[PDB]
Amino acid sequence: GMTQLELLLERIIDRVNVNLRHQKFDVGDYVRRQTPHLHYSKFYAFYGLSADDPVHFHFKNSSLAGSYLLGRVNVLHSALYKSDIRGDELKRKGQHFVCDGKMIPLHDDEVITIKDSFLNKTLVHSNSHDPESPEEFTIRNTVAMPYANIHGSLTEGSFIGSFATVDLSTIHNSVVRYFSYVQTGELVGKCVEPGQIWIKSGDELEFHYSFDKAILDKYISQEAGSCPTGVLMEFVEVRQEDFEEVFASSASGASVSGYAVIKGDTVIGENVLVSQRAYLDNAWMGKGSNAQENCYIINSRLERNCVTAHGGKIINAHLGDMIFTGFNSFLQGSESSPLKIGDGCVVMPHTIIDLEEPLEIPAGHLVWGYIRNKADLAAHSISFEEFAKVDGEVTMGRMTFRGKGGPFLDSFKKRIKRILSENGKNFTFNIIQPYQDGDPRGMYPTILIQPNN
Amino acid sequence: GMTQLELLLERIIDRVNVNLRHQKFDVGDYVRRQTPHLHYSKFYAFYGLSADDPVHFHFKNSSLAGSYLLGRVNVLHSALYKSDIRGDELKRKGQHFVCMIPLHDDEVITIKDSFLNKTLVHSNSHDPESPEEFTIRNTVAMPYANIHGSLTEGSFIGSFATVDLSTIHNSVVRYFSYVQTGELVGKCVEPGQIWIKSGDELEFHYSFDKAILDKYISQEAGSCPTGVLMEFVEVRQEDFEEVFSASGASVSGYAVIKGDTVIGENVLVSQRAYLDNAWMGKGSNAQENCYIINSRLERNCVTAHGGKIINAHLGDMIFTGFNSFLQGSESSPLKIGDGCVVMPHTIIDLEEPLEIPAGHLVWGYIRNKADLAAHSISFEEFAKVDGEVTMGRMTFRGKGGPFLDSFKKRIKRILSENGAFFDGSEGTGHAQKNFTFNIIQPYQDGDPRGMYPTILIQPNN
Ligand SMILES: [Cl-]
Numbered sequence: 001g002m003t004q005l006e007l008l009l010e011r012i013i014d015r016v017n018v019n020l021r022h023q024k025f026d027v028g029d030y031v032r033r034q035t036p037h038l039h040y041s042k043f044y045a046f047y048g049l050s051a052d053d054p055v056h057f058h059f060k061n062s063s064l065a066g067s068y069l070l071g072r073v074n075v076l077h078s079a080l081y082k083s084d085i086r087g088d089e090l091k092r093k094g095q096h097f098v099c100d101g102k103m104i105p106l107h108d109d110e111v112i113t114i115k116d117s118f119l120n121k122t123l124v125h126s127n128s129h130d131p132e133s134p135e136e137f138t139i140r141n142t143v144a145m146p147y148a149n150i151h152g153s154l155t156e157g158s159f160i161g162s163f164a165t166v167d168l169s170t171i172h173n174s175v176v177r178y179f180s181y182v183q184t185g186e187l188v189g190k191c192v193e194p195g196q197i198w199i200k201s202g203d204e205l206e207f208h209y210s211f212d213k214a215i216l217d218k219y220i221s222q223e224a225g226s227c228p229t230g231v232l233m234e235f236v237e238v239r240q241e242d243f244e245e246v247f248a249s250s251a252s253g254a255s256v257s258g259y260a261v262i263k264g265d266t267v268i269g270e271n272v273l274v275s276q277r278a279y280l281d282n283a284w285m286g287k288g289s290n291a292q293e294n295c296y297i298i299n300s301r302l303e304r305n306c307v308t309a310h311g312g313k314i315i316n317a318h319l320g321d322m323i324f325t326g327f328n329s330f331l332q333g334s335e336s337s338p339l340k341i342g343d344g345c346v347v348m349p350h351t352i353i354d355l356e357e358p359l360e361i362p363a364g365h366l367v368w369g370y371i372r373n374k375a376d377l378a379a380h381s382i383s384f385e386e387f388a389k390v391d392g393e394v395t396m397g398r399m400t401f402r403g404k405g406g407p408f409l410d411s412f413k414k415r416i417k418r419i420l421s422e423n424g425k426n427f428t429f430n431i432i433q434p435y436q437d438g439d440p441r442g443m444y445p446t447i448l449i450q451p452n453n
Numbered sequence: 454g455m456t457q458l459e460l461l462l463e464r465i466i467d468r469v470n471v472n473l474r475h476q477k478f479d480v481g482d483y484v485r486r487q488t489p490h491l492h493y494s495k496f497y498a499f500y501g502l503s504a505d506d507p508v509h510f511h512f513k514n515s516s517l518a519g520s521y522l523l524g525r526v527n528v529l530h531s532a533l534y535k536s537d538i539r540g541d542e543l544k545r546k547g548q549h550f551v552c553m554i555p556l557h558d559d560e561v562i563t564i565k566d567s568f569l570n571k572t573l574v575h576s577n578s579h580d581p582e583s584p585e586e587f588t589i590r591n592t593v594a595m596p597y598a599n600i601h602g603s604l605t606e607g608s609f610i611g612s613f614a615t616v617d618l619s620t621i622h623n624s625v626v627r628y629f630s631y632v633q634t635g636e637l638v639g640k641c642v643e644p645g646q647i648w649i650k651s652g653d654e655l656e657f658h659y660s661f662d663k664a665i666l667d668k669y670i671s672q673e674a675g676s677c678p679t680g681v682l683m684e685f686v687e688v689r690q691e692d693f694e695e696v697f698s699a700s701g702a703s704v705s706g707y708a709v710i711k712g713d714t715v716i717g718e719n720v721l722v723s724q725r726a727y728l729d730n731a732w733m734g735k736g737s738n739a740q741e742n743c744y745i746i747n748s749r750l751e752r753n754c755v756t757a758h759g760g761k762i763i764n765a766h767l768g769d770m771i772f773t774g775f776n777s778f779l780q781g782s783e784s785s786p787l788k789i790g791d792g793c794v795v796m797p798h799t800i801i802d803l804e805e806p807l808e809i810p811a812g813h814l815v816w817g818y819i820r821n822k823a824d825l826a827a828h829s830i831s832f833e834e835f836a837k838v839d840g841e842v843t844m845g846r847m848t849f850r851g852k853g854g855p856f857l858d859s860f861k862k863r864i865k866r867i868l869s870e871n872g873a874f875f876d877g878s879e880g881t882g883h884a885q886k887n888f889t890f891n892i893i894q895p896y897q898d899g900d901p902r903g904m905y906p907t908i909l910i911q912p913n914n
Pocket residue numbers: 033081
């Protein structure tokens with residue numbers, strides 16, 4: 001027969017597949033593996049406990065192997081493998097969901113509910129931005145691959161590829177493939193191929209970029225039945241070890257999680273926030289800067305007020321005042337080819353800078369795509385000053401934009417500003433173990449954790 | 454302002470004191486301590502998970518620091534410090550408590566508004582008033598106490614005290630006292646009393662000299678237990694932390710096995726058993742919290758919880774009672790002949806070599822031969838008794854024969870259930886017929902520090 005876990009996976013596969021059926025996309029070989037009951041029972045999982053935030057966890061008929069969960073989370077008939085479910089931004093009862101001048105009071109504390117889903121090394125963060133569900137950040141009938149980001153995005157009946165990002169969007173019965181970024185409000189019954197960057201707000205704003213596959217695949221790709229490969233993968237994996245070490249484990253206004261890696265000649269300035277799963281190596285953090293979960297900052301200097309979003313990687317770079325580095329960005333200079341970024345620049349999500357020569361980006365530029373040199377930069381950037389005049393359609397190679405450039409640019413300024421603001425929490429991670437043998441091996445029993453009266 | 458744990462303890466104390474108010478007994482200083490929140494948060498607890506037995510745990514408003522829990526257990530508004538709650542023998546739905554009523558439900562342990570310190574809870578409910586519920590409520594228990602098949606309520610159980618197969622209500626049972634009396638209501642049992650009482654036609658009493666007892670074990674309010682017995686166990690609790698091929702045999706991974714220990718066939722060595730240079734003959738059974746050291750046990754020997762055997766040679770089917778301390782040495786070796794029954798809370802501390810003949814009943818305090826004479830009797834002579842007998846500090850009323858058979862029946866049944874008589878087919882038992890201890894952690898800071906949150910663990914549908 002099949003073990004409970006082997007059966008659990010097949011049922012998830014089947015539920016996801018029926019929902020995705022119109023996309024003729026089979027998740028099976030992305031999920032399915034060798035005697036997982038044996039692989040999974042090897043692992044603990046961890047749940048956060050805080051004196052200051054009332055606990056809620058409900059784990060029912062699931063596996064959690066190697067996962068960390070924080071906040072209020074239900075895991076139902078699911079399998080989470082080395083994922084991070086971060087419910088620290090979830091709203092509380094009596095708080096309001098605000099929408100186009102309406103305010104909807106929450107009946108109950110917001111929870112993250114994961115149901116009939118398989119999440120592999122996936123980060124789930126922020127909260128519900130869909131007024132259909134203000135009390136629940138629902139992920140159901142979903143598969144997500146390594147280093148995916150489900151950021152403030154209700155997801156159902158969908159597939160989220162490796163290093164794919166879904167941002168403040170409702171995802172319904174859709175495929176978002178590796179290294180694709182989606183911020184569209186809603187994505188319904190779609191198939192987004194790999195290496196697409198897509199922003200869409202209303203009917204007067206739309207940005208699209210598309211990576212040359214031949215180039216992208218070197219950094220990240222994945223084939224069904226096999227796990228992801230490429231530079232980005234090597235990069236994160238080769239460092240996961242150092243994260244282990246730090247788990248087992250001076251500047252005014254600064255906060256540095258114990259759950260961050262801090263390495264070499266790192267200098268933490270004032271008002272600097274370094275969150276968990278942040279990785280700093282020889283990092284000079286200028287006043288006001290903010291490293292976020294799952295970002296890497298290496299042999300770099302950030303002058304001031306720089307925000308690095310989740311999955312953001314910065315190597316051998318010098319950043320000025322208030323640079324915003326988007327999701328999953330790979331900004332690699334070297335010692336022979338240093339990278340400079342001028343004040344106020346916005347580096348769009350999923351930007352890959354991999355220098356062959358020294359490069360300096362001038363202040364007040366919007367940057368995207370693939371950049372190795374000066375020519376590439378010219379083909380993959382524009383100044384705020386020029387772009388802010390745009391009212392219509394612009395094409396620059398693999399990039400198209402439709403709408404007003406001013407408000408677009410402003411959407412990014414507001415976002416860094418809000419992060420730097422809000423930015424300016426006492427808890428530990430408790431162990432949870434699975435069945436060690438027999439049929440239920442690798443499964444966790446039905447567990448309900450809550451506060452004492 | 455008090456923390457949640459400090460407050461929890463006070464609440465417990467106040468409840469238990471109301472129960473005990475007619476005895477004017479204050480449990481306060483036995484329970485209470487310095488910044489307990491800081492101390493208890495330093496510890497993990499453990500719950501047993503089986504693929505084979507449906508899990509049930511419910512922990513509400515409690516601290517579990519350093520404790521181990523197994524089987525169907527509810528812990529409510531309680532503080533359990535380094536205790537062992539063992540529900541492995543609880544009954545199941547459809548089984549039949551003889552008095553025959555059926556159980557309509559699986560039997561559950563419920564501990565509520567109690568404080569249990571290095572206490573062993575075992576067996577099940579022997580009260581026909583409460584067949585489906587083994588309750589321990591408004592109770593305080595001190596180190597190395599046994600609550601064995603005994604419902605307790607509004608009571609105090611002293612250090613190394615044992616309450617066996619009895620319902621204990623608004624009573625104080627003091628240190629190293631053994632009670633098996635069916636029910637013990639509104640009583641006060643002083644230290645070092647051994648009391649068995651069945652119906653109206655049976656009663657046994659022994660009493661230790663206090664000057665003597667106190668050297669082995671004593672406790673005063675506000676302080677923890679002292680004495681030889683305390684130094685003995687504590688000097689070894691370390692070897693336990695570390696730890697945490699014979700036909701028909703079963704040795705727990707959670708047991709200590711040391712030196713030149715030999716595990717015979719059909720041998721059952723349970724968790725928290727401690728063997729060191731123990732030759733364990735076929736059928737023998739080392740239970741939780743027992744110690745067997747520099748000893749040879751010939752066969753079918755059962756050593757009850759707390760039983761300690763040192764530098765001894767035991768024959769065939771010796772029954773060593775609860776919390777016994779049987780110490781010989783190399784210059785003073787101890788021999789116990791076939792079939793002997795060593796009553797609960799027996800203390801042998803040899804000054805000279807001593808051999809106990811086969812088919813003897815032993816109790817009390819024994820260092821030499823003179824003492825042995827004063828503190829034992831042959832089954833053959835005792836079986837003749839129908840009436841009253843006195844032997845020094847020992848008193849007996851009833852029929853000696855039935856009394857003896859009550860012991861024999863027990864060892865025999867234990868052996869049997871243990872699968873001591875495994876032929877390779879029939880006589881199958883525990884030693885032949887599986888879980889892990891999983892961790893739980895408390896709150897590490899603030900107000901709730903040292904507390905565990907509310908946890909409900911159950912099977913998947
Ligand atoms: Cl896997």
